[PDB]
DNA sequence: ACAGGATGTATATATCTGACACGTGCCTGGAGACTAGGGAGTAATCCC
């Protein structure tokens, strides 16, 4: 899957919207998993508080329609 | 009115979040020992 998201993310330059989501189990390790294979190309998750939700969110929601982002932070987790 | 398929219930598990709860570093106001000025206690006494 990983694979298929740099594929597709830098031979078509559109390194993209990205979320992935799964149980709240296994995402420390999809954590780890990121940070081996492309940390060249940055990630951000959520776990915790409803109020860190709403902080977190706001640099997540896609901050710019047009180009995809242009940035800082790209694969929801 | 009866049949059929919807929703409802039951017993047992599971994950995941919320609004509480407890636990700890650390300052400053309370406690202790002390003196001495003095308001208060107290006997005395005029007299309303």
Not at 31 to 38: D, H, P
Not at 54 to 69: A, E, I
Request: proline share 6%.
């Amino acid at each position: 899957s990983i694979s298929v998201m740099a594929y597709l993310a830098e031979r078509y330059d559109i390194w993209g919207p990205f979320l992935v989501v799964a149980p709240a189990s296994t995402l420390h390790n999809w954590q780890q998993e990121v940070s081996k294979f492309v940390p060249d190309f940055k990630v951000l998750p959520y776990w915790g508080t409803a109020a860190d939700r709403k902080v977190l969110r706001k640099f997540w929601d896609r901050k710019h329609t047009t180009y995809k982002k242009d940035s800082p932070f790209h694969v929801m987790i």
